[PDB]
Amino acid sequence: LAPSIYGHDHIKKAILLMLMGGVEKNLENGSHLRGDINILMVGDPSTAKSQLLRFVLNTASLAIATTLTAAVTTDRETGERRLEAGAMVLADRGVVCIDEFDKMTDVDRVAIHEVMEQQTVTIAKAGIHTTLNARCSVIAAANPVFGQYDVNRDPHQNIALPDSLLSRFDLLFVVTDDINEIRDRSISEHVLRTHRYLPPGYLEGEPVRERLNLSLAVGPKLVTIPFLRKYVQYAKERVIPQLTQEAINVIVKNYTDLRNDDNTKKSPITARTLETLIRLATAHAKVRLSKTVNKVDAKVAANLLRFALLGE
Amino acid sequence: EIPELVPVGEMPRNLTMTCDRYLTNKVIPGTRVTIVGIYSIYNSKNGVAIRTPYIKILGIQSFTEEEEEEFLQLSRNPKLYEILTNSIAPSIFGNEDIKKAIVCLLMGGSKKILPDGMRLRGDINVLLLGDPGTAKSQLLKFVEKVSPIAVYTSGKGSSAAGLTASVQRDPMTREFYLEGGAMVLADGGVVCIDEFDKMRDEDRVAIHEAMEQQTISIAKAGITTVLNSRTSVLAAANPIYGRYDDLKSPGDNIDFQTTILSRFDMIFIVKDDHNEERDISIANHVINIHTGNANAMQNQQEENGSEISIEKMKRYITYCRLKCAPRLSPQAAEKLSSNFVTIRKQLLINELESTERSSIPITIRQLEAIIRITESLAKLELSPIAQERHVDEAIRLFQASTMDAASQEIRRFEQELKRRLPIGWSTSYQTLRREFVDTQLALDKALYALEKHETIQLRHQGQNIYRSGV
Amino acid sequence: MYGDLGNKLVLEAKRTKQLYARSNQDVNLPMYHEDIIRNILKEVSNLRKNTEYLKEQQQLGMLDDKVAKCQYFVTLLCMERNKRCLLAYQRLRTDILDSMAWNNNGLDTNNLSHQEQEYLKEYCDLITDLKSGDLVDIDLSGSLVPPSDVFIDVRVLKDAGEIQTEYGVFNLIKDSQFFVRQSDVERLIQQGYLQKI
Amino acid sequence: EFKDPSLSLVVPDFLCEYCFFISDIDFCKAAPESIFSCVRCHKAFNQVLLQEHLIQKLRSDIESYLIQDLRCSRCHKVKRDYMSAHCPCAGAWEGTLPRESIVQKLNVFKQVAKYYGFDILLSCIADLTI
Amino acid sequence: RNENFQMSITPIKNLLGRDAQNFLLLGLLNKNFKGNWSLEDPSGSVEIDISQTIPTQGHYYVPGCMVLVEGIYYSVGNKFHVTSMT
Amino acid sequence: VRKDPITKEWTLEGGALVLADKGVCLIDEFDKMNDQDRTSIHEAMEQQSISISKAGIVTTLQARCSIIAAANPNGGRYNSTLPLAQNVSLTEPILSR
Amino acid sequence: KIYPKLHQMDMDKVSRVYADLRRESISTGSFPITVRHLESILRIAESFAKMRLSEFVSSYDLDRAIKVVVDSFVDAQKVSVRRQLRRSFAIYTLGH
Amino acid sequence: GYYDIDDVLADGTEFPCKFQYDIPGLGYLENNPGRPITKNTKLNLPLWLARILAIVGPVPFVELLPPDMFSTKVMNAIKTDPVALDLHSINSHFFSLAIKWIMLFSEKELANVVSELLLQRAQELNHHASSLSITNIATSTFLLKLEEMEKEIYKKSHESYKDTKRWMFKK
Ligand SMILES: Nc1ncnc2c1ncn2[C@@H]1O[C@H](COP(=O)(O)OP(=O)(O)NP(=O)(O)O)[C@@H](O)[C@H]1O
Ligand SMILES: [Mg+2]
Ligand SMILES: [Zn+2]
Ligand SMILES: [Zn+2]
């Protein structure tokens, strides 16, 4: 994924686990608990975020581009009101890509809780009192509302989004424009080679003509994106991993460690983190194509989650 | 009607008029024209026994094979950049680097298309932020004269509709149509937004797409549409608190967000130096303006070739825009990359020193601005390649503008040095480094503070710290 | 690739030919591109060293009848291409120099290579030999517009004082006007002292 | 406007050995008696000694020009390196002893030499150009 | 013009950000205002570590001398570690 | 600007500084206008023009006015212990005009 | 009907006035002396000449214009400094 | 001719080449001197090189695949509307290159089509060359679509007409 992007290995691993996301749990009486995974990339602008959303959008399938929920709507010619689908409804059992998520308005954010908790959205006007399936795995990205991102302040403080909203996401990354000379040297020379591009047959210094498309209207083992698509398709097609007890032992070990180490002082780690570990370990079992989740999967998932939340 | 013919206190009047066959598409909005036509009448649907007047056009008047030669000769002149720099706002004394940057904004960089169909900005955006009476508005109202396409607005005169585009209902058909705002009317040239700091927040939001995506996306009256806005924003603004306040950060002196500030290829922060010799020079110049000698002075400079006329420069800017689009040489490309990592290292040390992140983001987006300036500088002389000298001047202008916009325990070490080094004697820097570090970057701030005061003077290639003052 | 510098050089050639062709006058030709020519000659030396290296290693003879033959062919064709590009550039600037010799010197110097400076000296010496031996009854370097009129009016555009001609004088007073035989003043029209026709 | 008609040409710490007096003497603003003789005692000064001191001052200023540090013309930092073409703040380099001032110093030296008839100092001034 | 070069020189300003890579320099041998030994180029300057170097023996080496320098650039201290000098 | 009830097109209507073109405009209690009104003065007061861009209309009007303004200092009356910038709420740009 | 001209005005008088006003206006709370205030002197001198129906601006018009502007600046001050400023600028005004 | 600059540039254009052998050392054509070019390597080579490697090798070292500028798409666009076609965008030297290709492989269809193309465009070229001011935007939009070959013919022709009009009406 995204081979042009310097660093960001853990981000790409987390993206792959979301693309291979966790399994749904309908308990007795049909009591529903959500298997899908949700991610948010906070950070500076000019970082990898938006480009990663392009690479995710072009890698995933049933993927919706945004830059929500569901609504009852009307337009100029309609003498009537119609129920409309937002991106999560359109991405039911698919994915949503939300760039500039810090910009979303209040009536949207108030209803995002239903997507995040219940994987559904409820309608409550014009007598259409109903609830819709919106069972997607979301990846979002956001920018500071003022200035460059202050890495000392929380996401709740650098961005207007509430902590009671930001906490819904399984993984919450903060990325920043590190001023590293090796990175800067690399991306600089790539941008310079881009701006030195001369189209075919143009003389040196010749201006590019807008006439083109109508005038010509005469009619390191990294894989290909189609192969990666075919792999994720095969995993979804061929396995639904079962959850083994040794995995559980690693999971409860790591959760209760995270919830009593100094990591508590950084975040009030809670039950959502526990079920997130189960989802991520299940997703790693889907990476393996393995018929079960096992202790090996939990060991990978806890390392990634500890890095994502605490940076270590 | 022509604005300088409107009667005093009148609202400017206008006529609807028609043309057909080979007179269609012969003019664009904003062009000044002479029309020959039949003044005539028609009985519109909308008084009594009244009729709507209109003109049936019979003629319109609004490169030549010798101005081709003139602009070749002017390209061949070695002093061209100084000549154009003098020719921008010639009555305005000083502001040399700002005038140089205005020439770059007028010429623009080179617009590009990639194999993917992706397209890259050629337009430069410049923000002049600074003190009152620094001739900012005068510079914008000059640029609206010389630029072949231009629009002038003021921030408080704006609305989002009158900026991007608006719905209209045509009185002739009596049916809807969409009509362009200031950004669309500036497409292919400069929009001069004067007193930009007074603009409402929703208007400044509406600027974003037209300024960076260079489009306006529309869904109004059921008309879904997207318009093109290839535009240079030349914005002028005062600081918050009126005069620029040196004790405050630029992020405090400026209301604009870091997002919108990033979209300006160059920011100049302009201040009164209050220097007596400068003010005397300005005063002699201003009185020469008012006494009327300036007319003869500019005519002399134009006969001398030290300046060129407005129309000649307008034709020349159009000639450069239509005939040339330079590329960076490989040497220039490497030098630009190295300069990028250099200024990035400089911002890193400044942000560590200030322990605060700058209001100005020196991201990869600003390298695109330096590339764009390099291309414009080569575009003046119609050189098909932008050579290393053009990168030198482009780097000089960026250092003169946006770097100055961005680049804005010791108590113990400074007085230890005051005690240990007496007046009139010299300390070699390397020994001071060893002496203080062995007790540590507070050293060079102590040097900077004691250098700003008269007390210490770096001397002999900076190797000798000389206690020159008190 | 070895031919690219040749393309850049002959693009320079095409542009200077257009620079000369588009204007009505003889435009003084631009600077000799010693830098690109040095790059190409260095490339030729690289190719010569490659042929020497290969022809030495042909005594080891790796599939030489096809492989060494093919390698030798490609590195030889690169040298043929670069010779063509260099000679095209030099032949164009030579043609312009010859044209200028006939148009002026038979009656900007920094931009020439020193070989071109001494070439131009020799070609001017040759022209002046042709209009000095036999055929000297005709100034072979004279105008090629046919003589339209025997007498013309000419306005003095720059002052040159009293000068003689074969049976008289002109006093070239600034902004005086003569009516005179064209064959007695053509030399001064070409030298830019006289204005009309 | 009043500008002082006298350009000072001071020779610092000149010594009268006859009374060990250490005086700065100004060849333009001083009266001629105060140049050619002391002003605590009144013994006369040797002419060749005096011309030698003016030549020492002249060559001191030529050297001080040639060894000067360059300074940035807008941020006033010293040029700390050997091969930059301009300061990193975009400003051009300028001398800390601008050339105009040194031409002025040489001009007062030629005037003083012509007036007092200082043959040796005049030969030195001549041998600079020629 | 010398046959040994036409590896070849990189101007010092090309080094910046090209971490842990071999380079051949040509430089004016400064001693910086901070006191460290240094090379300067029309394009810039870089501090040098000579602690591991092998100089060529038929020469003096003084400040201000133009010296060829081969070594590995290191971004971590922004030093250039000289293999050999001539 | 207003949408003309006859034509249904948008038209400008001049404000005080258009009506007082080539005249003088008199602004009493300048200190107690809203700053979102005061900021409109800047262009006409110095550049002698008003540059509207609204409802499709985009134009520059002439506004050749001398403005004479009357104001009370901060709090209620003058206090000569202070300099001007603390006597009055007005900022340097408008005051410089 | 009347359009005065600044024929042979005292440039250096005005320039020194602007230079000194600018220097004393360095006080960060004072009335912000600016290039448009120099133009104000010239406009005002034209207005006084206009009152005389005068084709040409005299020294007296320009002196009165300077005196008006200098008084306007000098009285825009905290009283702790007004006397010193009055004494300094008196060299320009008390010639008339 | 040898020194003919527009011929030298035409020889500098690139064509798609498929190799018929494995050859060591030629990898510099694939930007790496250290390796062979393999059989069935498909590579764009300059025409001055591709012309010779297409003939010498018995099987030659290279086979020339059909270039896109002579694809059936372009040939169809030629055969509908010669004067509307932007040959300068297709290739700035298309007539010189078509002559060279027609000679390299005897291709009667391409010769007939290129003859028709040139003739039909020659009519319109003469119309714009003959028109004179007392220049039209219609002329300008047509001249943008001319090859360097056609630009040379137009320049020479238009100069002939202009010089004749000058001589007739002026003294
Ligand atoms: N450097 C200068 N040279 C000549 N005239 C100047 C100069 N600076 C200012 N002026 C004059 O002073 C006025 C400047 O007005 P203006 O252009 O509005 O300045 P500004 O930068 O826009 N200040 P503001 O409108 O308060 O933000 C004009 O009348 C100019 O003639
Ligand atoms: Mg202004
Ligand atoms: Zn004595
Ligand atoms: Zn500096």
Closest C-alpha among C99, C1, H147 to residue C91:
C99
**DSSP sequence for H92-105:** TTHHHHHHHHHHHS
Which of F14, F96, F97 has the CB atom closest to B11's CB atom? Answer: F14
3-state secondary structure of G5: strand
CB atoms within 10 A of CB B144: 21
Written as one letter, the residue type at F35 is D
Residues, CB within 5 angstroms of ligand 3 (ion): D 16, 18-19, 21, 38, 40-41
- What are chain H's partners, defined as 3 or more CB pairs within 8 angstroms? A, C
- Do the Cβ atoms of A205 and B383 come within 8 Å? yes
**Pairing assessment for the beta strands E54-55 and E79-85 based on DSSP bridges:** parallel
3-state secondary structure of D37: strand
Specify the residue with its C-alpha closest to ligand 1, atom 5.
B92
Q: Is residue B84 part of a domain?
A: yes
Please, which residues have CB within 8 angstroms of residue C80's CB and are 6 or more apart in sequence?
Answer: H48
CA distance A225 to B389: 43
CB proximity B69 to C under 8 Å: yes
CB atoms within 10 A of CB D43: 11
Specify the residue with its C-alpha closest to ligand 1, atom 4.
B92
Q: How many angstroms away from the CA of H26 is the closest CA of chain A? A: 25
- Do the Cβ atoms of D85 and B392 come within 8 Å? yes
- The answer to whether the annotation marks A45 as part of a ligand binding site is yes
Interface-testing mutation among H70, H89, H93, H142, with chain A (most A C-beta atoms within 10 A): H89
Closest C-alpha among C21, E43, G46, G44 to residue B342:
E43
CA distance B105 to H140: 28
Selected residues 33-72 of chain E with any CB under 8 Å from a CB in chain B? 33-35, 43-44
Angle between helices A181-195 and B330-354 (to 10 degrees): 140
- Do the Cβ atoms of G15 and B132 come within 8 Å? no
Please, which residues have CB within 8 angstroms of residue B120's CB and are 6 or more apart in sequence?
Answer: A194, A195, B111, B112, B113, B114, B368
Query: In chain H, count of helices (H) and strands (E)?
Result: 8, 3
- The answer to whether the annotation marks A86 as part of a ligand binding site is no
Angle between helices B310-323 and B364-380 (to 10 degrees): 110
What is the signed CA dihedral for H139, H142, H145, H150, rounded to 10 degrees? -60
In contact, A292 and A242? CB cutoff 8 Å: yes
- Closest residue of B to G56, CA-based? B291
Please, which residues have CB within 8 angstroms of residue B1's CB and are 6 or more apart in sequence?
Answer: B12, B13, B14
- Ligand 1 atom closest to the Cα of residue F46 is 18
Can you list the alpha helix ranges (DSSP code H) found in C101-132? 114-130
Q: Which residues of B are annotated as a binding site?
A: 130-137
Centre of ligand 1 to C-alpha G38, Å, is 11
What angle (nearest 5°) sits at the alpha carbon of residue A81, between those of residues A77 and A85?
110
**Pairing assessment for the beta strands A95-98 and A63-66 based on DSSP bridges:** parallel
- Do the Cβ atoms of E28 and D82 come within 8 Å? yes
CB proximity B187 to F under 8 Å: no
Ramachandran angles phi, psi of F5, nearest 5°: -65, -20
- Do the Cβ atoms of F81 and G28 come within 8 Å? no
Structure tokens at E3: 């046959």
Q: Is residue B322 part of a domain?
A: yes
B124 by Cβ neighbours in 10 Å (0-12 / 13-18 / 19+) ranks as buried
CA distance B294 to B285: 9
User: Which residue(s) pair with B225 in the sheet?
Assistant: B218
A63 by Cβ neighbours in 10 Å (0-12 / 13-18 / 19+) ranks as buried
Centre of ligand 3 to C-alpha D22, Å, is 9
CB proximity C23 to B under 8 Å: yes
> Residue A186: its chain E contacts at CB < 8 A?
17
3-state secondary structure of A89: helix
**Pairing assessment for the beta strands A130-133 and A25-26 based on DSSP bridges:** unpaired
Q: Is residue B252 part of a domain?
A: yes
CB atoms within 10 A of CB H54: 19
Rg of the Cα trace of chain E? 12
> Residue G77: its chain F contacts at CB < 8 A?
83-84
Closest C-alpha among A238, H113, G26, B193 to residue F43:
B193
- Closest residue of F to G72, CA-based? F84
- The answer to whether the annotation marks D75 as part of a ligand binding site is yes
Q: In this structure, is the dihedral angle defined by the CA atoms of residues B7, B9, B10 and B12, taken in order, positive or negative?
A: positive
- Do the Cβ atoms of C73 and H53 come within 8 Å? yes
Query: In chain F, count of helices (H) and strands (E)?
Result: 5, 6
The enclosing domain of B80 has a CATH number of 3.40.50.300
Q: After which residues is chain C broken (C to N over 2.5 A)?
A: 107
How many structural domains does chain B have? 1
Measured in Å, how far apart are chain C's first and last C-alpha atoms?
A: 54
Q: Is residue B269 part of a domain?
A: yes
CB proximity D86 to B under 8 Å: yes
* Parent domain of B194: 65-406
Q: What is the DSSP letter of B31?
A: -
What angle (nearest 5°) sits at the alpha carbon of residue A198, between those of residues A193 and A199?
130
Q: What is the DSSP letter of B25?
A: T
Q: Is residue B198 part of a domain?
A: yes
- Closest residue of B to G6, CA-based? B291
How far is C-alpha B198 from the chain's CA centre? 18
Q: Is residue B315 part of a domain?
A: yes
Q: Strands of B150-154's sheet, edge to edge?
A: B150-154, B189-194, B231-237, B126-130, B266-270
**DSSP sequence for B338-353:** HHHHHHHHHHHHHHHH
Closest C-alpha among A293, A195, A310 to residue A247:
A293
Ligand nearest to the CA of D44: 3
Q: In this structure, is the dihedral angle defined by the CA atoms of residues D56, D57, D58 and D60, taken in order, positive or negative?
A: positive
Specify the residue with its C-alpha closest to ligand 1, atom 10.
B135
CA distance B224 to D70: 63
CB proximity C187 to H under 8 Å: no
CA distance A120 to B225: 33
Written as one letter, the residue type at H68 is D
* Strands (DSSP E) found in chain A: 25-26, 32-33, 39-43, 63-66, 70-73, 82-85, 95-98, 120-123, 130-133, 137-142, 171-175, 242-243, 292-293
In contact, C195 and C154? CB cutoff 8 Å: yes
Q: Is residue B304 part of a domain?
A: yes
Q: Is the CB of B133 under 6 A from ligand 1?
A: yes
- The full length of chain D comes to 130
Q: How many angstroms away from the CA of H74 is the closest CA of chain A? A: 8
Centre of ligand 4 to C-alpha B49, Å, is 76
Residue H56: HSE in the Cβ half-sphere, 13 Å Cα cutoff: 15
Which of H4, H12, H23 has the CB atom closest to C67's CB atom? Answer: H23
- Do the Cβ atoms of H49 and C77 come within 8 Å? yes
- Do the Cβ atoms of D82 and E30 come within 8 Å? yes
User: Which residue(s) pair with H44 in the sheet?
Assistant: H16
Ramachandran angles phi, psi of A209, nearest 5°: -95, 135
Residue keyed to tokens 């032949």: C91
What angle (nearest 5°) sits at the alpha carbon of residue A152, between those of residues A149 and A153?
70
Q: How many angstroms away from the CA of B1 is the closest CA of chain E? A: 58
Structure tokens at E5: 């070069």
Centre of ligand 2 to C-alpha B138, Å, is 7
Residue keyed to tokens 């090209």: E18
Q: Is residue B51 part of a domain?
A: no
Q: How many angstroms away from the CA of E36 is the closest CA of chain B? A: 8
CA distance A43 to G10: 62
Can you list the alpha helix ranges (DSSP code H) found in F1-97? 16-19, 35-38, 41-46, 84-87, 92-96
In contact, A96 and A87? CB cutoff 8 Å: yes
- The answer to whether the annotation marks A124 as part of a ligand binding site is no
Q: Which residues of H touch C (CB under 8 A)?
A: 2-6, 8-9, 11-12, 21, 23-26, 28-29, 46, 48-49, 52-53, 56, 61, 155
- What are chain A's partners, defined as 3 or more CB pairs within 8 angstroms? B, E, H
3-state secondary structure of C29: coil
- The answer to whether the annotation marks A48 as part of a ligand binding site is yes
Residue keyed to tokens 């900021």: F39
User: Which residue(s) pair with B268 in the sheet?
Assistant: B128
F31-45: burial string, b at 16+ Cβ within 10 Å, e else: eebeeeebbbbbbbb
* Count of B-F CB contacts under 8 Å: 106
Structure tokens at C136: 């000297």
3-state secondary structure of D125: helix
In contact, C172 and C161? CB cutoff 8 Å: yes
E60-70: burial string, b at 16+ Cβ within 10 Å, e else: eeeeeeebbbb
* C-alpha to C-alpha distances, A180 to A184, A276, A311, nearest whole angstrom: 6, 33, 18
3-state secondary structure of C99: helix
- Ligand 1 atom closest to the Cα of residue F97 is 26
Q: Is the CB of B92 under 6 A from ligand 1?
A: yes
Q: Is the CB of B318 under 6 A from ligand 1?
A: no
